[PDB]
Amino acid sequence: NSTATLCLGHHAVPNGTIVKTITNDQIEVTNATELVQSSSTGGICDSPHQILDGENCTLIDALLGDPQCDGFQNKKWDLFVERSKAYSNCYPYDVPDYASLRSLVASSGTLEFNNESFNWTGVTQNGTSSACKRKSNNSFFSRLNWLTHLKFKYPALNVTMPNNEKFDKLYIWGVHHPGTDNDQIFLYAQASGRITVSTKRSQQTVIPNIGSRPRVRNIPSRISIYWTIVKPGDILLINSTGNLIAPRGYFKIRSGKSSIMRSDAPIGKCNSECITPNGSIPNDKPFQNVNRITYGACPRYVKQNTLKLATGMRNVPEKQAIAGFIENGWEGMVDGWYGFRHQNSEGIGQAADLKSTQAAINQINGKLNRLIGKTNEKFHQIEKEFSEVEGRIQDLEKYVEDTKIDLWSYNAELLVALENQHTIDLTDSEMNKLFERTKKQLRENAEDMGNGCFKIYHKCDNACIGSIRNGTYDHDVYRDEALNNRFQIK
Amino acid sequence: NSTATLCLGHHAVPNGTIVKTITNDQIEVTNATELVQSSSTGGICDSPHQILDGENCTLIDALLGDPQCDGFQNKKWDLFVERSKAYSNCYPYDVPDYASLRSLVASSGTLEFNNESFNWTGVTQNGTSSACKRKSNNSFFSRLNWLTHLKFKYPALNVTMPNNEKFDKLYIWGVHHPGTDNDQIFLYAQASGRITVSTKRSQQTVIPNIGSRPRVRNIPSRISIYWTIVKPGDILLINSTGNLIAPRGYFKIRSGKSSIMRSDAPIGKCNSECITPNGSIPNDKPFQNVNRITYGACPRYVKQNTLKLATGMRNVPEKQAIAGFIENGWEGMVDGWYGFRHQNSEGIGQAADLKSTQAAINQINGKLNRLIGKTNEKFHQIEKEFSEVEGRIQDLEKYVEDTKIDLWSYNAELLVALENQHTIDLTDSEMNKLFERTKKQLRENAEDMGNGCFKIYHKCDNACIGSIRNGTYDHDVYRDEALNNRFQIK
Amino acid sequence: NSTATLCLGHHAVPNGTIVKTITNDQIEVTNATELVQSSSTGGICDSPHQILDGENCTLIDALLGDPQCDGFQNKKWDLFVERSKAYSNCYPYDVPDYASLRSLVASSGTLEFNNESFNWTGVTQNGTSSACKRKSNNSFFSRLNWLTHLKFKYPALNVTMPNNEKFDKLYIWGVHHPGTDNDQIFLYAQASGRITVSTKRSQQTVIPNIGSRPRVRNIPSRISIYWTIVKPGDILLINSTGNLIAPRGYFKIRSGKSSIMRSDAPIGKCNSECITPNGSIPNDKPFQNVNRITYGACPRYVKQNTLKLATGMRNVPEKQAIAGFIENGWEGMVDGWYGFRHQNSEGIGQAADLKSTQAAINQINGKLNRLIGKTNEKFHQIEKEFSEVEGRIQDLEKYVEDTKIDLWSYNAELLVALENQHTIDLTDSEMNKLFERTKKQLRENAEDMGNGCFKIYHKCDNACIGSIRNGTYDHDVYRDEALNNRFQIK
């Protein structure tokens, strides 16, 4: 009696969460949020990127014009999606440096094709095959022109096509490798010889090679596919005596943000910025462990499957006389993070301190604002999965990606530890600041009891306590009473 | 009266600057410095690196010996500068893997060439062309030897050149692809056949291919360029029946720090360690946003166009009775960063505290010393801009560089935030330390007024105040007076 | 007299060590530990990885079956070690893209070979050479079959081998380039023609090229080596009229963690997880400066040759009346890190504080636990040293590795500075916490003397001092005595 107690404290919750800081591998805090995205819907959203589902067609099949890919003519995409079920159903072919032609067409993002009138005087055009049926008739790749002899003559071709446009032209062409010498004569009326396709700045010479390969869709022959880009002011020149699978025109070649992805995920009617082979994923979080292959505004790939960011202070159980924050949280404090408990003539009371609570909350919201909803866009990259063994180039592609992921995984680990340490520090600091400013108000009218509470040595009723909480307490009013109570022989 | 006031404080400035810390996206400090270099002079300084301006010549034109490049013979460089205006003016040629030959010669850093006496018995040497004029006469690449028939015979060449030196030899040679069968016979007196250039450890076979290409400087033929490196103790062997553009000797191949850069920046008479395509840039700062392409001791390329490093404390306006540092800076404090203000019998005074001021300044200068003027040198790297579409290899080169820049940009962002937080912390700490040590000196002779000031409960004249500032105040001298004043019923 | 002194302090050592923090380039602490591994034993331990020492054989020589490599047949490895002394001693050969075949076999980790019965009707099998002696007889590569004419006929080969297995088959084969037209006829009875090796998904055509190369072990001819991987359900088809160096079967191709390393280090009977070309190195430390080439659970390569992690507090000399921690350490404090010194009626004493000491030690041990003995495994990577000049691909391989090392070296530098700052902070904090809690116990019975000591204003014998140290001091017992002593006119 003749005194009061005023304790400073902070909240605690019954269901806290464990995070990592620089000081502690495990510390329980009142709340945290997940920074690694680990699930996908399992579908690729068809918005807001332009998606082209290849269905049974690879990009290269759609480029050459396999009959089952006729519906793709002239289409564009942000992301071309190639399915594992895709298969070729025309004349058997290969592309030396297939991966590069696939990449450059994918990045260009368009199959726009402009027909041109090549002068094929002296040969038969439009060769077809039972291996490439279009609406039940023998046919061929839509964008290619199989030239054969005319009246058992195949005169030497020396054919030109100038580029008088303001843009580049991509030409796709081929060399036919017949199964037998019989086929060579039947088709071209003479022995095979080289093909040379040239411009002012480039030349490619290819040798047709007669011979049986293992039959594919019953065909032992092959076509090998080549490409040439022709600049404005340059000229395509084609020089051949046979075996030429000629271009019917050129593809536009564009630059932009298009790419290609291998995925079996279904395409859905929905909207998501970040695409992975597993499906679209939300991009609120800064990191993700779903797939290293991404397109769009995506979280960065890391190895961790969880990284928890503290969003509240240390969670400290309440010890079973009122008491302050020293080794003690207040589970009953539910309208603030920090506050006051008092005992005086009028009872025992609690009040939240708004300023300290808001100071902590604002700083935590600040770091969430830097980390949440801030992903950056990436588009065409490098391949990261491989179906064939290749050696040196693939070794480098894999090492580049491994290197990158380990460096990001490190950054993520350090960032979360540093941020969590800072959160513990800033929330501890708001408690300490509140205690110190209360101490300063009280001057010589109170003593520190060592448990986060002051013994106030004068009668201090509810309004008096309120004056301390509100920062309007006038210590001079009570000093005489308090000094007498403090410094009395007992 | 019978008392004095002593306030602890810190300076403030009218023109502060905004920086970023871990706690605050924006906090005003008294001063900061820029860590991202964003401008260039626009010229490449000719010192201290040895610069070779290619003018109208590419490195490869200078290597082969295009007549307009004769002035480059045998020159060395640290940095070869290739101009966008550069053009070839000799026989039209291509180099399979041009980029690699360009790179290896660039990195070697020398065009030193040693003539050798090949045994070309039975052929005519020194073929020339109107397409390659030297001083108005028909000529040819200086370092190459166009062999043609002698008396309508071209006997099979089987020619040797041993390397009996202690160093490697770089041989440059070529294959002529004539426009027509008429030219083939006119030049070599027989049908074309393969060329084989070999050593004990390597072999290259190349097939001349007759045919018209689009005319370049009125020439429908082409030369294709190849290279062979011959080790000490090995032997070059050249085997041909025509179409051989022979070497006249070898290039020295060196190892060191040389490179090549594409730039149109003028070369100036000045001295700068760091070269970019935009010109030389100062290298005081740790980061730069001028160009990802660099040579020499250069700041690291980042995406940010500014990163401000705090070089002073938080800048806090002065509130409109003297008062201390609590929510309050002192704009009138101009000879120190921290200090004392007092009110006593003799007036109101101010003095700077040297120790605390110097402690902060020394620590800030320390971090400037780690960050300023400490760039590291890089020399030949990878190419980072491309004039042609290529696919896989280029995709990887671009991804490697993008990856690197994003990781450095992250490091830069975190470093500056961490350093700035530390600067705010260390400057706040010097203020708090000064307050605490003053508190300790005063013992029971003063009370904390809560605004960064002490109420000293005894007469404390100028010399008394000085004794506190100087750390020589003897509290026992005044304790009796002070205790009487403090603990008095009023 | 009628008073006592109680000082709070921390230990100091005569032999401290210099570390780097964020605040200080150099600060002496009581102890530190090295985080960069800089030495090796100089031997490669034969455990726990399966080591295969190539001795005089390269992997490719062991693959083809050079007689000196017969002992390697069918062996497996985790790490194949190639020696600089290794040399070929059979028919001279080259491998276009040698580096890739070396890499893919190295990564597969097995030389397991299954013989198959090819139908070589109409030719002579098992050609041998004096250039490839096996037990003093003319012989040839064990895994290859040199086919020559039979009765001066070499009928066109068109030979099949289906893959009816559940795994992939690696075929190694070759093309013989004879020195002269005489050898061509002597061996194959007709002019040279192309070789085509194909599957349903691939084709390779190679042209034998007759001509003398510089003699190697007295042989001017060459064999060029090729490879083909055949999938389950696919078929190998070989088509040739001569010059075929045929496969005798296939290699198993596996996937796993195998690699290859160039080293001259001796192999020892010992156990070490981390292998470098310099020898095995311990992997307790997180970083190493021994070699960028590593295999196994290894520290990460950095440029620094030392990084010292503080494992104790700031080391502060003792100043030459007892005194506390303010600018002063206690070299005589050897059974604790923090403690108490007192002066009372019964003498001058010292005692360690266990709690504070253990708190610091536990946190330091925690960070050691994150950093020590926690390396991660890497296996087959990219090559990092090169014996030949190559240009573009090598430039990229080198730049990737340089980039990686600089980023890790940065991470290491920042990590150690941050950790050391945290250690200084946490150890400083334990001292400050101990002082503050002692202050709180003492209430109004003591004053802070400003040197880390309290003047206790009552008789405080050994048991009284112990009660303070033990946290059981009851300030109310002594308050009357203390207040009288404190507030007395003198």
Ligand SMILES: *[C@@H]1O[C@H](CO)[C@@H](O[C@@H]2O[C@H](CO)[C@@H](O[C@H]3O[C@H](CO)[C@@H](O)[C@H](O)[C@@H]3O)[C@H](O)[C@H]2NC(C)=O)[C@H](O)[C@H]1NC(C)=O
């Ligand atoms: C070189 O050898 C090849 C493999 O032995 C061979 O290919 C095979 O040819 C046979 C016979 O033409 C094909 O068998 C087909 O036989 C009947 C004929 O009416 C067809 O109706 C069937 O569809 C049946 O498949 C094989 O399919 C074929 N095998 C492979 C792997 O392609 C070549 O013919 C040989 N080349 C030469 C020039 O002789």
Ligand SMILES: *[C@@H]1O[C@H](CO)[C@@H](O[C@@H]2O[C@H](CO)[C@@H](O[C@H]3O[C@H](CO)[C@@H](O)[C@H](O)[C@@H]3O)[C@H](O)[C@H]2NC(C)=O)[C@H](O)[C@H]1NC(C)=O
């Ligand atoms: C294959 O076709 C080529 C393109 O049509 C052709 O090249 C062209 O040849 C003509 C005629 O020689 C050149 O025209 C030149 O005509 C007069 C002749 O006196 C010259 O004075 C002029 O300079 C004029 O240019 C073209 O310049 C040339 N076109 C190109 C694109 O190179 C080849 O000649 C043909 N090849 C064969 C073997 O017939």
Ligand SMILES: *[C@@H]1O[C@H](CO)[C@@H](O[C@@H]2O[C@H](CO)[C@@H](O[C@H]3O[C@H](CO)[C@@H](O)[C@H](O)[C@@H]3O)[C@H](O)[C@H]2NC(C)=O)[C@H](O)[C@H]1NC(C)=O
């Ligand atoms: C093309 O030129 C080559 C280099 O001059 C040449 O190779 C050289 O051939 C000679 C003679 O055969 C070899 O000399 C050998 O002479 C005696 C003959 O009994 C041997 O016992 C010795 O071992 C001695 O070496 C050279 O070794 C050889 N030089 C090289 C560098 O390989 C070719 O023969 C020529 N090719 C043609 C088709 O003529």
Ligand SMILES: *[C@@H]1O[C@H](CO)[C@@H](O[C@@H]2O[C@H](CO)[C@@H](O)[C@H](O)[C@H]2NC(C)=O)[C@H](O)[C@H]1NC(C)=O
């Ligand atoms: C490229 O075109 C030229 C010109 O048409 C071809 O040259 C003719 O080839 C025929 C058939 O081999 C010869 O009989 C003529 O004598 C050639 N004409 C001229 C004007 O030289 C040439 O063969 C073609 N080249 C290729 C590789 O197909």
Ligand SMILES: *[C@@H]1O[C@H](CO)[C@@H](O[C@@H]2O[C@H](CO)[C@@H](O)[C@H](O)[C@H]2NC(C)=O)[C@H](O)[C@H]1NC(C)=O
């Ligand atoms: C490499 O040089 C050898 C030796 O000079 C050439 O071989 C001669 O070639 C001529 C012309 O074709 C033949 O008539 C001779 O019979 C060959 N001589 C010998 C000793 O074999 C060979 O042709 C050259 N090779 C190449 C690819 O040019």
Ligand SMILES: *[C@@H]1O[C@H](CO)[C@@H](O[C@@H]2O[C@H](CO)[C@@H](O)[C@H](O)[C@H]2NC(C)=O)[C@H](O)[C@H]1NC(C)=O
């Ligand atoms: C691949 O094998 C086929 C079939 O055996 C070869 O074709 C024969 O080649 C001979 C010799 O040149 C000719 O006389 C026959 O007329 C061909 N037979 C048939 C059925 O066409 C062919 O030459 C081989 N190809 C290669 C590149 O070696």
Ligand SMILES: CC(=O)N[C@H]1[C@H]([C@H](O)[C@H](O)CO)O[C@@](O)(C(=O)O)C[C@@H]1O
């Ligand atoms: C362009 C052309 O001639 N196409 C014809 C081919 C080829 O002559 C041979 O297949 C070449 O080997 O033969 C067919 O029987 C076929 O297989 O469909 C009919 C087709 O019209």
Ligand SMILES: CC(=O)N[C@H]1[C@H]([C@H](O)[C@H](O)CO)O[C@@](O)(C(=O)O)C[C@@H]1O
């Ligand atoms: C080495 C040689 O023979 N050079 C001569 C060439 C070539 O014979 C043809 O250009 C080959 O196509 O012809 C010229 O008229 C020329 O164009 O300058 C004269 C020159 O001396």
Ligand SMILES: CC(=O)N[C@H]1[C@H]([C@H](O)[C@H](O)CO)O[C@@](O)(C(=O)O)C[C@@H]1O
């Ligand atoms: C497969 C074969 O025929 N091997 C024979 C070779 C070759 O005929 C020529 O070396 C080819 O140039 O010649 C030998 O004298 C030799 O050099 O060892 C004997 C050997 O049995």
Ligand SMILES: *[C@@H]1O[C@H](CO)[C@@H](O)[C@H](O)[C@H]1NC(C)=O
């Ligand atoms: C925990 O923190 C997150 C992020 O600020 C917030 O959205 C959520 O409401 C909080 N949860 C609780 C139970 O307070």
Ligand SMILES: *[C@@H]1O[C@H](CO)[C@@H](O)[C@H](O)[C@H]1NC(C)=O
């Ligand atoms: C793709 O091919 C499969 C298998 O032939 C067929 O059943 C399916 O209808 C095809 N899909 C499309 C879209 O053409």
Ligand SMILES: *[C@@H]1O[C@H](CO)[C@@H](O)[C@H](O)[C@H]1NC(C)=O
């Ligand atoms: C096609 O090329 C031939 C060359 O043999 C030429 O003579 C003819 O005029 C060209 N045809 C047309 C329609 O221009």
Ligand SMILES: *[C@@H]1O[C@H](CO)[C@@H](O)[C@H](O)[C@H]1NC(C)=O
């Ligand atoms: C995504 O697909 C990859 C590759 O197939 C797989 O490893 C991973 O488990 C998948 N992740 C999720 C969340 O579906």
Ligand SMILES: *[C@@H]1O[C@H](CO)[C@@H](O)[C@H](O)[C@H]1NC(C)=O
């Ligand atoms: C605000 O201050 C006044 C001072 O008279 C005090 O009585 C009142 O209770 C305070 N309000 C609160 C909500 O604490």
Ligand SMILES: *[C@@H]1O[C@H](CO)[C@@H](O)[C@H](O)[C@H]1NC(C)=O
């Ligand atoms: C601000 O800081 C920089 C770096 O220390 C210093 O060079 C400059 O003089 C300072 N400017 C002012 C106005 O104090």
Ligand SMILES: *[C@@H]1O[C@H](CO)[C@@H](O)[C@H](O)[C@H]1NC(C)=O
């Ligand atoms: C480069 O070529 C241009 C265009 O022909 C010419 O005007 C200029 O003088 C040349 N410069 C040099 C240095 O030869």
